[PDB]
Amino acid sequence: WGSIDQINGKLNRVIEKFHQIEKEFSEVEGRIQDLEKY
Amino acid sequence: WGSIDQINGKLNRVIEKFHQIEKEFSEVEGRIQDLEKY
Amino acid sequence: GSIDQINGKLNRVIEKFHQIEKEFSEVEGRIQDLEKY
Numbered sequence: 001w002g003s004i005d006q007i008n009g010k011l012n013r014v015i016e017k018f019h020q021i022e023k024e025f026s027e028v029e030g031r032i033q034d035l036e037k038y
Numbered sequence: 039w040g041s042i043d044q045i046n047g048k049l050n051r052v053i054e055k056f057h058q059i060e061k062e063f064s065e066v067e068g069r070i071q072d073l074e075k076y
Numbered sequence: 077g078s079i080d081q082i083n084g085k086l087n088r089v090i091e092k093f094h095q096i097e098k099e100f101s102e103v104e105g106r107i108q109d110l111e112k113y
Contacts, residue, residue, distance in 0.1 A: 004045060
């Protein structure tokens with residue numbers, strides 16, 4: 001990547017995808033609670 | 039320096055969040071292990 | 077050098093993210109397995 005603008009664009013894409021992984025992780029953690037809870 | 043400092047700041051905040059999430063993954067793995075074992 | 081250091085740091089973030097994606101996928105697969113069998 002040659003420009004600041006491009007590095008920032010790529011970083012934003014990572015951030016957006018990560019936002020989604022965090023949400024999915026939260027949902028998985030809930031499913032672990034349910035299994036523990038029985 | 040303004041653009042470089044802002045990109046660095048943002049990258050550092052991402053890196054920190056990723057270190058946090060890895061700690062949470064470690065804890066969740068422990069809980070999965072307990073469900074698999076017991 | 078800066079653009080180079082920034083690129084390096086971005087590449088490390090990207091790599092870490094790919095690791096995270098893989099860990100999460102492995103975690104989810106184990107939960108799935110526990111849920112069914």
